[PDB]
Amino acid sequence: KRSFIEDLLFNKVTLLICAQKFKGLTVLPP
Amino acid sequence: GVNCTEVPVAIHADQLTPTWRVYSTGSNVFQTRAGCLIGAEYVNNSYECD
Ligand SMILES: *[C@@H]1O[C@H](CO)[C@@H](O)[C@H](O)[C@H]1NC(C)=O
Ligand SMILES: *[C@@H]1O[C@H](CO)[C@@H](O)[C@H](O)[C@H]1NC(C)=O
Numbered sequence: 001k002r003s004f005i006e007d008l009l010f011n012k013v014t015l016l017i018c019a020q021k022f023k024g025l026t027v028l029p030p
Numbered sequence: 031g032v033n034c035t036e037v038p039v040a041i042h043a044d045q046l047t048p049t050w051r052v053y054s055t056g057s058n059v060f061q062t063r064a065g066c067l068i069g070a071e072y073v074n075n076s077y078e079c080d
Contacts, residue, residue: 026031028064029063029064
C-alpha cells in the first residue's frame with residue numbers, strides 16, 4: 001500500500017558480501 | 031538470525047556451546063524474521079507493544 005512517489009523513492013534508492021561476513025558481523029532488523 | 035531447523039538438530043549431549051540444551055525441547059516454536067522463538071505461543075490478536 002504505497003503511492004506513486006513512494007514507489008519512485010523506493011526504486012531510486014538501492015541498498016554475497018553479507019554472506020562473506022562470516023566474521024561475527026550481523027545486521028539486526030528494525 | 032538462525033533458521034530454526036538448526037536448534038532441533040542441536041538437541042543432543044555435548045553438541046552445543048550453551049549448556050541448557052534441555053530447554054531446546056521446550057514449548058511451541060515460532061518463526062520470526064530475526065530468529066526463532068522458543069517458549070512463547072503466537073496468538074493472532076493485537077495489543078500495545080511491551
Ligand atoms: C528454513 O529453511 C527452510 C528451507 O527448507 C524454509 O522452508 C523455512 O521457511 C526456513 N525457516 C526459517 C525460520 O528460516
Ligand atoms: C487465529 O488462530 C486460530 C488458531 O486456532 C485460528 O483458528 C484462527 O482462524 C486465526 N485467525 C486468523 C484471523 O488468522
